[PDB]
Design a protein around this ligand. Structure first.
Ligand SMILES: CCCCCCCCOCCOCCOCCOCCO
Ligand SMILES: CCCCCCCCOCCOCCOCCOCCO
Ligand SMILES: CCCCCCCCOCCOCCOCCOCCO
Lengths: 96, 13, 482, 96, 903
């Protein structure tokens, strides 16, 4: 998944004329293996039996990355690297 | 890593 | 289908219609200037003088310039999307600064003539911005003429290039190829920009991070001294020498704490903005420094000669700041001027050796004023300023007789790259083969002869035009006979 | 409304922000009527041992509230199951 | 696929199946006539560089269009496809064949078709597995370097360590102050002298064993193929793993899957799908190509042999010493352990088509597909490292995404206007789109290796700014192709297409191209029966195509953010722009003659081409006074003239033997006919090359004569001057006016290969050779190992001992204190002939699988790749290059032994 939020600059009815932007990327991978042996038979005419044996492995791995920036003054020049430094820097996001 | 030893010719083609 | 795809993070070049657009392009001009006039580009003309000796750490990077290797120094440096360095990088960054200042100046002139600004304060600010751009055009043209044009005491040149300057563009177009101007045309253009810009900029300094009238006076005095006219140099340096006090320190650690910090240094006329995150850079060529935990360890590619160390008396404050005894942990001296600034640090405990750009300080205005006063025949002013500068620096001069001036100017401006211009202007030959190395550093700093002898009047004091020019327009006359 | 250049000439002519005679509709200003589209085409079949099922489809649902809450998917499916020989049978379910 | 009158060369499936590399186009070196494949690195993640009929443009790309099953793909995507799924590969090197492809199909089209299931009563199950090792191919150039004792004596005599210095003083009090550095570190303090001798003057260290290794390679796949009377399927799952042969780690690893499905629904509809996907891990050795100290093949050549990176056990240490250093230098396995790097890329390509025949005749076909790549890479700088500059660590995470869509809708109506007059009309539409972005974040200041999430860094001045990069394009195209065929022997083809791209301006983006081809079957009209001749066709074509591969936003005049303070933003000028950028037009005339022989046991093809590039896209070198590096412009022209001929045979002997052969050849003459700023020549600075009007891309340097035997100086010929009867005139002062255009081309003119194949009752042997003739390269490493002027701390060649002195005055290497130049004594003749692969296979006989019905076949092969090279190049590899041989990752040498069970 790949998610993008934005807050636009040069807006009169807002508290700041500066814009913000945030970009996240999500990933999750699941793997599964199941192996199975079934034998069905009949001892007599009046008896049926079914035997089943099996193995199963389930695995999951998830991950989130995400980064934000602020201090924009135009709608065109709003990439994530064209923000203001200093006090407008934040720590990124990361979860596993 | 390390120190770079200079006088290379810049490759084009 | 519409197939129109337009870039992200990029807008179009338009004429100026607002006042905030003029402010934005002016801030872009200053951030471009910070990556041009920084000390990393003036290391090449500093090593080429007779003060440095390459150590055994050198990987042929500084060895063309120190040992005068004219087979490499002809076509030297890169300027492309990977690297910008060398003589070709020095040419490219000042031509880029000149062209972008031209675009800013012509666009704000046309916006002033079309009456797009609202109030009168916007007109006054736009005229101040125009003068601040004229100063930067003057600086770019002067620094190209400094390296790529001959001083008048030259003997053998390529035929027709003794009274030539550089290619002079006065309006922005990137599709122009043409011949070189003369020296008189370029110098009247520089001095017209400076004299038109002094009459508009205000009397007192607005900010230390922007061009003022003090910087225009200081630059005009520097150009007039390097031209050879001492009366106008003294007359321009007298207007700025008494507004900036020297560093008042009592020992070497106090001088180190006040000198190295840009924010508290009380004698900076002009400097670039620097933070820990925006505007800082490491200049570790002349000292070779590397952080290690909490301290610094040095591995220099070139160390000074013994006659350079013997200029400083033992009680001088600059003999532990400007040059330091830190080679092989205690054994020898290196040039430690651009070490670090403790404000631009990630963690306050651990060094990262980041500095900022400084464009002018008042301790060069003193030296311009003393040299011009000595040459125009004025003895009390030269003493009045040389005793003051050398007593504020730690060890006072006894007699003022233009040997003390040469020694003090060599002591004060080390690392800034003014010695090659001085030894051209003073008729000093090289004598790199005659000097001895530092005796404590043997095994590390040894004797390498010059690969080309450089007497007085050698052509190779001025650089050769880079080989993208002389290839794209063949009406460019080159400098060197070879 | 007089401090803003976008509203200083709109008060009294097109913008009446305070109206006391007949009251406003705050259900029309916060909820709406919202469309929904579907569409799907599938191919099934099969033969001597082999069977398949392919499909491609589209879904669009827009939320009824004015602050946007859409959901839109473009999807595809291919189920497949073959009998290779007398003892082995292979198969795959692919989806995106 | 193509036209009857086109020049199409088809490569079968036996040239693509069992190859031990992830570079599929490397398997085609010396296989197609006129196609020049050169791979310039032995990195497992490196990729090939193809040029069909010479280089075509000076600024734009010359790569072909790469097409897998209709959708055009990059070569890094084809790197993630199992080549046991490929049925054939056809190279359309013409103008009447590349008429329905239009992005950059002036450069040729490489068409790859995947396998579909041949339908029967029982499907087929094959299981391939393979394992092999990979080595370095040339360890000869380090048999000429100095030893340790000779290097220290040469350095002491040459004044590098100072005047009045004995070899014993430099040996003892200078260099063996490695006790002082190792005594400051707690892990090396009590290990120096016991099991750690970083400076060793008795023995000589082996740096080839420290910097290179023997790597493994493995692969395996299971594949099912079947089908009924209507439908058909081919499924395949696989695995490939290749390790790099350097200690600096580089690897390629992928897990692939493919399902090709095709179904006849009813009497008017036919649908199909080609689904593919992979999970791949790449890592490239990203320090090669540059000069560092103990890195690469430059490090095996130039490190001083008295520096030991090993232990007393013979194993590699963690650090070594170099004199003057302030900290130890990490070896490659330790630097790769404190700087980890993982990449994981998920790839999915889904194609599909629906074909409708409403009436007899016309056939409406619609086709659509999407390629989606999601890459996620991470790198660290581990904390608490004693041999670092800081005890704090960093971490950087990036997330890449690419998405490419394509739609193609054609309608073909085929009919017969009489008994013996055939016609065919085709019209079509094509829309290609791309968008991609990179997002990235970083963090610094970690103190423990378990608390290293990206949200756990320092929070002050240790914060930084993220990364973000977006790119996109689009192509729209319409085409039509008509065919006419007379009675059976005369065929004419006509073609008209219209191409628009997003890379050009809004009133310059559209172009019109056309093609006319013709084939004449001389054997089926003129000489209808003969005893020896069996087929004779004569084809001839003229066409016009276009090239548009330059980069996305290159015609706009732009402005970017250049901040000054942290309060307000600033704007600088980015580019100059070019409002009238348009396509690059290429016209090609082709005339070919194909012939057969004794019941098709011998066959031959001869083709003559002329190719002309008008209005070429040059990234012109704007002069430095503009303030911009370069600018893309439509200026210049070029021309390529050549011939290529092919011939296949069968020379066999008896009932059981089957011996065959083949050969290729191609000569290609380039010529530049118009340059950019009204110039007649342009010398590219610091490359050693030139573009001059009338001649190909040549080399440009001074001519080294020898040395002056009376003074010891280096001497060069002054160009164009002869004195009295004598010889030419020399001079000992190096000027830039001594540089002459050499008649030696940058791109190699002669390219070819050949092949041998023999067999017996099951046992078979195959051998393919590939040669390049006419190649020259500047050896850059011989600037560093063959000079006495500078860089005296490195290891040098053994010839520098026998240098010119007043005592030793009958040598031929110069005096010591002189720098070398990049002149003719550094141009090496890099032409080669290489045995590409040597395969020995043995199909197990059908008598063993008589009664068992679960296994129906088996096949065992041995294989050796790159095991012979015939050169004069003294530089570890002739192929890795392109006018300058830098610190190169040489080509591998593989030994592979696999099996195949068709059960
Ligand atoms: C009518 C066409 C519908 C196709 C949509 C399905 C798209 C899902 O595929 C995603 C890509 O994954 C590739 C599958 O890998 C092939 C595995 O099959 C091999 C097992 O036999
Ligand atoms: C976006 C997601 C697309 O990912 C498609 C990748 O599908 C993986 C294909 O499965 C690999 C089969 O091979 C594994 C057997 O070793
Ligand atoms: C924003 C998302 C817009 O993208 C829509 C994707 O649908 C495009 C369909 O691509 C063709 C797939 O059909 C091929 C069948 O395998």
């Amino acid at each position: 998944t790949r998610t993008s939020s934005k807050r636009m600059p040069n807006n009169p009815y807002d508290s700041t004329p500066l814009g913000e932007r945030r970009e996240r990327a999500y990933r999750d991978v699941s793997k599964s293996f199941t192996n199975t042996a079934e034998y069905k038979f009949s001892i007599d005419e009046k008896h049926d039996l079914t035997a089943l044996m099996g193995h199963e492995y389930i695995e999951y791995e998830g991950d989130v990355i995400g980064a934000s920036s602020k201090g924009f003054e135009s709608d065109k020049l709003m990439l994530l690297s064209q923000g203001k430094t200093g006090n407008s820097l934040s720590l990124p996001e990361h979860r596993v | 890593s390390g120190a770079t030893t200079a006088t290379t010719t810049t490759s084009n083609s | 289908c519409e197939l129109d795809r337009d870039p992200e993070g990029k807008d179009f070049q338009q004429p100026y219609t607002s006042f905030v657009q003029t402010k934005q392009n002016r801030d872009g001009l200053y951030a471009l200037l910070r990556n041009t006039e920084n000390p990393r580009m003036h290391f090449y003309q500093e090593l080429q003088s007779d003060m440095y000796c390459t150590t055994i750490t050198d990987g042929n990077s500084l060895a063309p310039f120190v040992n005068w290797d004219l087979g490499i120094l002809n076509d030297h440096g890169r300027a492309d999307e990977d690297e910008v360095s060398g003589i070709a990088g020095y040419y490219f960054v000042y031509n880029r600064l000149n062209q972008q200042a031209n675009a800013f100046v012509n666009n704000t002139e046309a916006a002033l003539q079309n009456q797009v600004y609202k109030n009168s304060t916007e007109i006054a600010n736009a005229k101040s911005f125009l003068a601040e751009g004229k100063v930067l055009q003057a600086l770019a043209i002067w620094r190209l003429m400094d390296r790529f044009s001959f001083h008048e005491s030259v003997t053998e040149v390529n035929s027709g290039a003794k009274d030539l300057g550089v290619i002079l563009l006065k309006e922005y177009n990137p599709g122009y190829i043409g011949p070189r101007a003369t020296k008189a045309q370029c110098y009247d253009y520089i001095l017209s920009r400076l004299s038109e810009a002094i009459e508009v900029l205000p009397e007192n300094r607005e900010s230390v991070l922007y061009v003022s009238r003090d910087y225009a006076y200081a630059l005009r005095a520097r150009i007039y001294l390097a031209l050879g006219e001492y009366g106008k140099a003294a007359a321009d340096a007298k207007m700025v020498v008494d507004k900036y006090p020297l560093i008042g320190a009592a020992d070497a650690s106090e001088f180190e704490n006040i000198y190295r910090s840009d924010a508290n240094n009380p004698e900076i006329i002009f400097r670039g903005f620097a933070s820990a995150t925006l505007g800082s850079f490491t200049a570790t060529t002349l000292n070779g420094a590397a952080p290690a935990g909490k301290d610094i360890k040095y591995n220099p590619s070139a160390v000074p000669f013994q006659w350079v160390v013997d200029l400083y008396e033992n009680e001088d404050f600059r003999k532990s700041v400007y040059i330091a005894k830190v080679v092989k942990k205690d054994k020898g001296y290196l040039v430690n001027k651009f070490l670090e600034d403790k404000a631009y640090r990630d963690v306050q405990d651990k060094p990262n050796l980041k500095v900022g750009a400084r464009y002018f300080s008042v301790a060069e205005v003193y030296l311009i004023l003393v040299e011009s006063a000595l040459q125009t025949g004025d003895t009390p002013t030269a003493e009045k300023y040389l005793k003051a500068l050398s007593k504020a620096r730690g060890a006072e001069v006894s007699v003022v007789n233009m040997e003390a001036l040469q020694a003090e100017r060599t002591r004060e401006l080390i690392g800034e790259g003014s010695r090659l211009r001085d030894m051209v202007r003073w008729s000093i030959p090289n004598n790199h083969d005659a000097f001895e190395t530092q005796p404590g550093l043997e095994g590390f700093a040894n004797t390498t002869p010059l690969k080309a002898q450089a007497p007085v009047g050698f052509y190779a004091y001025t650089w050769e035009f880079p080989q993208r020019d002389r290839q794209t327009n063949p009406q460019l006359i080159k400098n060197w006979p070879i | 409304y007089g401090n803003y250049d976008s509203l200083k000439d709109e008060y009294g002519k097109t913008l009446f922000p305070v109206d006391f005679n007949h009251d406003a509709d705050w259900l029309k200003a916060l909820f709406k009527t919202a469309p929904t589209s579907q569409g799907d085409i599938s191919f099934s079949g099969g033969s001597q041992g082999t069977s398949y099922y392919a499909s491609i489809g589209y879904f669009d649902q827009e939320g009824m509230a004015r602050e946007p809450a859409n959901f839109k998917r473009y999807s595809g499916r291919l189920n497949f199951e073959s009998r290779i020989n007398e003892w082995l049978k292979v198969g795959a379910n692919l989806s995106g | 696929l193509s036209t009857v009158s086109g020049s199409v060369a088809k490569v079968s499936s036996e040239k693509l199946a069992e190859k031990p590399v992830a570079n599929i186009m490397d398997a085609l070196q010396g296989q197609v006539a006129g196609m020049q494949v050169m791979t310039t690195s032995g990195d497992p993640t490196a990729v090939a560089s193809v040029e069909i009929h010479g280089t075509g443009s000076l600024g734009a790309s010359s790569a072909p269009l790469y097409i897998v099953d209709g959708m055009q793909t990059s070569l890094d995507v084809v790197a993630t496809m199992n080549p046991n799924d490929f049925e054939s590969m056809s190279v359309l090197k013409d103008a009447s064949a590349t008429s329905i492809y239009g992005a950059r199909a002036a450069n040729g089209v490489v068409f790859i078709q995947t396998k579909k299931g041949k339908m029967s009563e029982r499907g087929r199950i094959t299981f391939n597995a393979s394992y092999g090792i990979s080595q370095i191919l040339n360890t000869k150039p380090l048999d000429n370097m100095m030893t340790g004792d000779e290097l220290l004596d040469f350095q002491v005599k040459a004044g590098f360590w100072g005047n009045n210095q004995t070899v014993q003083k430099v040996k003892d009090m200078i260099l063996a102050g490695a006790e002082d550095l190792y005594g400051n570190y707690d892990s090396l303090k009590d290990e120096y002298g016991k099991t750690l001798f970083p400076v060793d003057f008795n023995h000589d260290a082996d740096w080839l064993k420290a910097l290179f290794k023997t790597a493994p390679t493995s692969q395996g796949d299971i594949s099912f193929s079947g089908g009924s009377q209507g439908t058909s399927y081919y499924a395949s799952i696989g695995y490939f793993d290749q390790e790099g042969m350097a200690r600096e780690p580089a690897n390629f690893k992928r897990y692939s899957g493919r399902l090709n499905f095709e179904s006849r629904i009813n009497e008017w509809l036919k649908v199909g799908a080609n689904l593919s996907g992979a999970i791949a891990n790449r890592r490239s050795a990203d320090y090669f190509g540059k000069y560092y100290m103990g890195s690469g093949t430059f490090g095996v050549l130039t490190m001083p042999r008295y520096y030991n990176p090993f232990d007393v056990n013979g194993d590699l240490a963690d650090v070594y010493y170099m004199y003057g250093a302030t900290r130890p230098s990490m070896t490659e396995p330790y630097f790769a352990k404190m700087r980890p790097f993982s990449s994981e890329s998920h790839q999915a390509n889904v194609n599909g088509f629906a074909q409708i025949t409403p009436i007899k005749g016309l056939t409406l076909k619609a086709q659509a597909g999407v390629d989606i790549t999601n890459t996620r890479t991470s790198s660290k700088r581990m904390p608490n490292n004693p041999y670092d500059s800081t005890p704090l660590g960093e971490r950087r995470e990036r997330a890449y995404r690419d998405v490419s869509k394509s739609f193609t809708n054609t309608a073909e109506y085929k009919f017969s206007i009489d008994e013996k007059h055939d016609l065919t009309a085709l019209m079509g539409h094509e829309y290609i789109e791309y968008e991609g972005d990179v997002i990235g974040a970083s963090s610094k200041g970690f103190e423990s290796d378990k608390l290293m999430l990206l949200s756990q860094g320092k929070t002050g001045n240790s914060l930084s700014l993220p990364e973000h990069r977006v790119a996109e394009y689009a192509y729209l195209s319409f085409f039509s192709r008509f065919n006419y065929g007379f009675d059976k022997w005369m065929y004419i083809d006509f073609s008209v297409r219209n191409d628009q791209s997003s890379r050009f301006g809004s009133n310059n983006r559209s172009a019109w191209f056309y093609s006319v081809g013709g084939m004449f079957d001389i054997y089926n009209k003129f000489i209808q029966e003969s005893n020896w001749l069996s087929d004779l066709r004569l084809k001839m074509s003229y066409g016009t195509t276009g090239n548009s591969e330059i980069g996305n936003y290159n015609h706009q005049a732009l402005v970017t953010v250049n901040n000054y303070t942290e309060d307000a933003m600033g704007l600088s000028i980015s580019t100059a722009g070019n409002p009238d950028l348009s396509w690059e037009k290429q016209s090609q005339f082709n005339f070919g003659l194909a012939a057969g022989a004794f019941n098709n046991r011998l066959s031959a093809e001869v083709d003559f081409y002329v190719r002309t590039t008008n209005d070429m896209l040059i990234d012109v070198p704007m002069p430095y006074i503009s303030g911009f590096f370069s600018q893309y412009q439509n200026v210049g022209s070029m021309k390529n003239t050549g011939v290529d001929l092919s011939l296949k045979g069968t020379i066999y002997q008896n009932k059981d033997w089957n011996v065959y052969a083949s050969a290729n050849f191609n000569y290609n003459r380039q010529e530049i006919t118009k340059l950019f700023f009204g110039l007649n020549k342009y010398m590219l600075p610091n490359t050693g090359t030139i573009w001059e009007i009338g001649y190909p891309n040549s080399f440009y340097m001074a001519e080294y004569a020898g040395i002056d035997k009376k003074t010891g100086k280096q001497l060069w010929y002054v160009p164009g001057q002869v004195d009295a009867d004598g010889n030419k005139v020399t001079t000992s002062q190096y000027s830039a006016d001594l540089e002459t255009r050499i008649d030696k081309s940058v791109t190699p003119p002669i390219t070819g290969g050949f092949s041998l194949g023999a067999s017996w009752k099951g046992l078979s042997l195959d051998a393919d050779f590939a040669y390049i003739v006419g190649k020259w390269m500047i050896n850059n490493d011989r600037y560093f190992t063959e000079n006495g002027g500078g860089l005296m701390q490195l290891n040098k060649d053994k010839m520098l001992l026998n240098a010119w002195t007043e005592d030793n005055k009958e040598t031929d290497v110069p005096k010591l204190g002189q720098s070398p130049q990049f002149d003719t004594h550094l141009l090496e003749n890099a032409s080669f002939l290489r045995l590409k692969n040597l395969k020995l296979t043995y199909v197990l006989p059908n008598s063993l699988f008589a009664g068992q019905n679960v296994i129906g076949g088996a096949r065992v092969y041995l294989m050796a790749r790159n095991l012979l090279t015939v050169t004069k190049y003294k530089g570890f590899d002739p192929e890795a290059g392109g006018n300058v041989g830098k610190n190169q990752y040489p080509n591998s040498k593989q030994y592979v032994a696999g099996i195949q069970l068709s059960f």
